[PDB]
Design an enzyme around this catalytic site. Structure first.
Site, short mmCIF file in Angstrom:
data_model
loop_
_atom_site.label_atom_id
_atom_site.label_comp_id
_atom_site.label_asym_id
_atom_site.label_seq_id
_atom_site.Cartn_x
_atom_site.Cartn_y
_atom_site.Cartn_z
N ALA A 199 -5.76 2.89 25.25
CA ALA A 199 -6.93 3.74 25.20
C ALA A 199 -8.23 2.98 25.41
CB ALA A 199 -6.99 4.50 23.86
N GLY A 200 -8.19 1.67 25.56
CA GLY A 200 -9.39 0.87 25.77
C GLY A 200 -9.94 0.19 24.54
N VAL A 201 -9.22 0.22 23.44
CA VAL A 201 -9.56 -0.59 22.28
C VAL A 201 -9.17 -2.03 22.56
CG1 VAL A 201 -9.10 -0.94 19.84
CG2 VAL A 201 -9.23 1.39 20.76
N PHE A 202 -9.97 -2.98 22.08
CA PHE A 202 -9.63 -4.39 22.20
C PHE A 202 -8.63 -4.76 21.12
CE2 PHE A 202 -13.72 -3.80 24.26
CZ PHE A 202 -13.48 -4.42 25.47
N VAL A 203 -7.41 -5.09 21.51
CA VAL A 203 -6.31 -5.33 20.58
C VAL A 203 -5.79 -6.74 20.79
CG1 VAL A 203 -4.08 -4.53 19.75
CG2 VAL A 203 -5.72 -2.89 20.67
N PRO A 204 -5.88 -7.62 19.80
CA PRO A 204 -5.29 -8.95 19.97
C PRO A 204 -3.77 -8.90 20.06
CG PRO A 204 -5.80 -8.59 17.66
CD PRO A 204 -6.34 -7.39 18.40
N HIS A 256 0.89 -1.19 0.00
CA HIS A 256 0.00 0.00 0.00
C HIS A 256 0.92 1.22 0.00
CE1 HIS A 256 -3.23 -2.56 2.12
NE2 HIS A 256 -3.28 -2.74 0.75
N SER A 284 -1.80 -10.61 18.24
CA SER A 284 -1.34 -10.67 16.86
C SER A 284 -2.57 -10.88 15.97
CB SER A 284 -0.33 -11.79 16.64
OG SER A 284 -0.94 -13.05 16.77
N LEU A 335 -3.54 2.01 21.11
CA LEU A 335 -4.95 1.64 21.05
C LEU A 335 -5.31 0.80 22.27
CD1 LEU A 335 -4.90 0.86 17.24
CD2 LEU A 335 -6.51 2.50 18.24
MG LIG Z 1 -2.92 -3.56 -3.29
#
Ligand SMILES: [Mg+2]
Ligand SMILES: Nc1ncnc2c1ncn2[C@@H]1O[C@H](COP(=O)(O)OP(=O)(O)O)[C@@H](O)[C@H]1O
Ligand SMILES: O=C(O)C[C@@](O)(C(=O)O)[C@H](O)C(=O)O
Ligand SMILES: Nc1ncnc2[nH]cnc12
Ligand SMILES: [Mg+2]
Lengths: 324, 421
Positions: free
Chosen positions: A296-301, A274, A303, A293
């Site tokens: 800040a309280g975002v659910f982050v796996p 990209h 991986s 994130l």
């Molecule tokens: Mg592409």
């Protein structure tokens, strides 16, 4: 922030380009969603004269008009409020600017990759002035189950059926990646009641509409109960989600994972596929954004591998508490 | 994407195209030196090298050269050659990257006072281009909106408030011309640190820049045969240029960057996003030092395009043997519209053509893919494994996208109960 709602089961679109397979894919989706009418009212293609193209509505052959000139298409189809632009990178700028001279058009999808960033900033400026939502450039588009799908998004009928994209669930997503949005369709359909709406904002440095643009729409959409964001290395857009939660603007649960953690382990800078996926400061790395994130309280796996598991856990908590 | 250009490239374009009332000094007075330079010929072409003392520095996208002892200042030609002896051709580490010092610029030394050093920078954002000025170069800042002009009076008003009065006219003219130059040639980043203004005019002592490489179809007349160097610590490879040429010929996307040609882990993944996720997974499982490439193919390439892409990778991974054999990860999301049968048929054709080398190098292949016609794609992958004897483990939409990475690296068992699904 522009419109909260871009598409409905009554949306009609003009497609710019000779993209018969993509149009027929839209119509296959329209039919299994039980739409009253095809979502594509007309095509514009300047390399041929006016003619009619045969398409199929279920088993029935129908005709969709193809116009050499945009002005004729718009005049004959005042019901159209969406344009999907398959123009090549060389003419995508001019045709998109032209589309925005028609007040009926409130949403434009720009498919082409390779549009110069300075031209896209001018598209963004004109779109912001007019309140038109741009999805893209460099995108497959998006999909609103039951309602409308942009172009090639979600593929053919077998995938629409497999991932339950013929009726909405409660989970909205926004993705930087076209191909990975279809992986999200799959994951969300297996872990929740399914996709409500999904958008692929494209990979470019200045997406016509940003993560926070769509996250805010989803926050303001009653049918959406949770939100999934597939972010990416490069730029600082994802910190806006941190800010919105802190402000109390974003109250629905948000799951997010930013791809590009490998870049932190390379000894030299690597430009990924990209155009926007290159970190110009430490804060633009996927590792930094994932950490912010999470704080800040975002659910982050941990991986990408655990993304499905955290989506399912958030979904099941919402069901237990009567939100879904 | 925005791509860095060398200092020499940026100065050549600036000297060629900038419009100012300012007399820019030392135009085109630079000489490029490499380990192969014929110094007699260099001096024939650049006699000004004897006319005054000199500055020498690498031109390889190395930042902060002066702090690294990599700018030799106020030297005779003999002093430049002595300064280059321990540097030219030598391996050097800069930050965490290691590469050879092999491209240097020599320019005239410009005597000046610290008060004659200025800082100018222009860089792009969503909302327009910021223009920065500082009188202690070697900081006022203004957003120029997308449709706005930047005239000399605007620069004096918004940026030159702290600048010496006797230099405002020449600075404002230069910065105005610089900004028009930046726009006209599709720059996204342009830094001159220091810009020097003496009694004799304007000197561009340093230049760093990026241009929007997607604008070649607009700018090629002015850019010419512009070069985009790799970051310091990487080389450019013929296989990369070959893939880049394929990428230019259609709407399909074909990208390849070599990270470690001797690595035993190779990927051939569809999509910008998926290719990054697979790379992330490989590195999470400790494979960063063995990861040979980053790349992707996508946007519905043809059987032939995919064959030509794949054969490049198979050629690259059968150059020298590895004690523990090698791994090829052929992965992707569930595609929206890439024809998985047509693309996998092209890869299978490459595998067949390279089956000898692939067996000699003990390559094991792992496949995971969905999308249009993926069932036939997976079938032909299984089949070429059977007919060549190359071990190939083939998975579909019922396998988590990155699970094959752990399989390939031994972190998890191979689940034959999921083959082809
Ligand atoms: Mg592409
Ligand atoms: N041609 C020159 N004449 C005089 N001084 C110079 C010249 N080129 C560089 N210098 C001095 O050396 C410093 C370091 O050089 P520069 O090209 O700015 O490299 P960097 O920013 O990578 O350290 C400059 O800021 C300036 O003070
Ligand atoms: O083949 C893929 O997995 C990616 C893609 O080509 C697709 O068909 O979904 C996608 O549109 C892209 O352009 O990356
Ligand atoms: N001065 C020079 N020395 C060596 N090779 C060259 N090629 C062009 N100019 C050269
Ligand atoms: Mg400098």
């Amino acid at each position: 922030s522009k419109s909260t709602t871009l598409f409905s089961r009554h949306t009609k679109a003009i497609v710019w380009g000779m993209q018969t397979r993509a149009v027929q894919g839209m119509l296959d989706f329209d039919y299994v969603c039980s739409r009253d009418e095809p979502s594509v009212a007309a095509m514009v293609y300047p390399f041929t004269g006016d003619h009619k193209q045969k398409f199929y509505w279920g088993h029935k052959e129908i005709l969709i008009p193809v116009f050499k000139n945009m002005a004729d298409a718009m005049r004959k189809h005042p019901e159209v409020d969406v344009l999907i632009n398959f123009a090549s990178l060389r003419s995508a700028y001019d045709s998109t600017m032209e589309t925005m001279n028609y007040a009926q058009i409130r949403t434009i999808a720009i498919i082409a990759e390779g549009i110069p960033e300075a031209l896209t900033r001018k598209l963004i400026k004109k779109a912001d002035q007019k309140g038109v939502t741009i999805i893209g450039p460099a995108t497959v588009g998006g999909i609103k189950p039951g309602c409308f799908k942009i172009g090639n998004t979600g593929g053919m009928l077998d995938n629409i059926l497999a991932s339950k994209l013929y009726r909405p669930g409660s989970v909205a997503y926004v993705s930087r990646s076209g191909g990975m949005s279809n992986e999200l369709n799959n994951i969300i359909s297996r872990t929740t009641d399914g996709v409500y709406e999904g958008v692929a904002i494209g990979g470019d440095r200045y997406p016509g509409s940003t993560f926070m643009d769509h996250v805010l729409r989803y926050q303001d959409t009653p049918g959406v109960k949770m939100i999934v964001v597939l972010g990416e290395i490069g730029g600082t857009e994802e910190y806006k989600i941190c800010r919105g939660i802190k402000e109390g603007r974003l109250t629905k649960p948000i799951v997010c994972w930013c791809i590009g953690t490998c870049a932190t382990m390379f000894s030299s800078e690597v430009q990924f596929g990209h155009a926007g996926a290159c970190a110009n400061q430490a804060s633009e790395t996927a590792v930094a954004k994932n950490q912010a994130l999470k704080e800040a309280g975002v659910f982050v796996p941990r991986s990408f591998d655990e993304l499905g598991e955290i989506i399912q856990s958030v979904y099941e908590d919402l069901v237990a508490n009567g939100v879904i | 994407s925005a791509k860095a250009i060398s200092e020499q490239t940026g100065k050549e374009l600036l000297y060629k195209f900038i419009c100012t009332t300012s007399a820019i000094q030392n135009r085109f007075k630079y000489a490029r030196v490499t380990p192969d330079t014929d110094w007699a010929r260099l001096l024939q072409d650049h006699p000004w090298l004897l006319s005054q003392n000199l500055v020498v520095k690498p031109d390889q996208l190395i930042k902060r050269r002066g702090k690294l002892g990599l700018v030799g200042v106020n030297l005779t030609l003999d002093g430049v050659k002595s300064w280059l002896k321990p540097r030219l051709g030598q391996e050097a580490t800069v930050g965490k990257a290691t590469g050879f010092l092999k491209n240097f610029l020599i320019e005239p030394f410009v005597p000046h006072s610290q008060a004659e050093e200025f800082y100018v920078c222009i860089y792009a954002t969503r909302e327009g281009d910021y223009v920065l000025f500082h009188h202690e170069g070697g900081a006022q800042k203004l957003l120029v909106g997308v449709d706005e002009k930047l005239n000399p009076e605007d620069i004096k008003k918004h940026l030159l408030v702290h600048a010496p009065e006797d230099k405002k006219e020449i600075l404002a003219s230069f910065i105005s011309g610089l900004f028009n130059f930046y726009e006209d040639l599709y720059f996204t980043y342009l830094e001159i640190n220091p810009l020097v203004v003496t009694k004799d005019g304007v000197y561009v002592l340093d230049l760093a820049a990026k241009v929007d490489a997607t604008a070649d179809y607009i700018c090629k007349v002015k850019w010419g045969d512009i070069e985009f160097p790799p970051p310091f610590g990487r080389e450019a490879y013929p296989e990369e240029a070959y893939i880049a040429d394929l990428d230019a010929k259609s709407g399909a996307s074909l990208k390849l960057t070599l990270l470690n040609p001797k690595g035993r882990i190779w990927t051939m993944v569809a999509g910008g996003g998926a290719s990054v996720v697979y790379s992330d997974t490989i590195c999470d499982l400790g494979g960063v030092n063995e990861l040979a490439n980053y790349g992707e193919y996508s946007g519905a390439p043809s059987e032939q395009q995919t064959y030509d892409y794949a054969k490049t990778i198979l050629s690259l991974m059968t150059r020298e043997k590895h004690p523990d054999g090698k791994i090829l990860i052929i992965g992707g999301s569930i595609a929206n519209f890439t024809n998985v049968a047509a693309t996998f048929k092209g890869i299978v054709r490459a595998i067949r053509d390279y089956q000898g080398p692939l067996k000699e190098h003990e390559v094991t292949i792992f496949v995971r893919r969905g999308g249009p016609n993926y069932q036939e794609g997976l079938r032909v992958m299984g089949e070429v494994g059977k007919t060549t004897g190359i071990p190939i483990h083939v998975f579909g939409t019922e396998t988590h996208m990155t699970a094959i990475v752990g399989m390939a690296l031994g972190h998890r068992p191979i689940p034959e109960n999921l083959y082809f699904q």
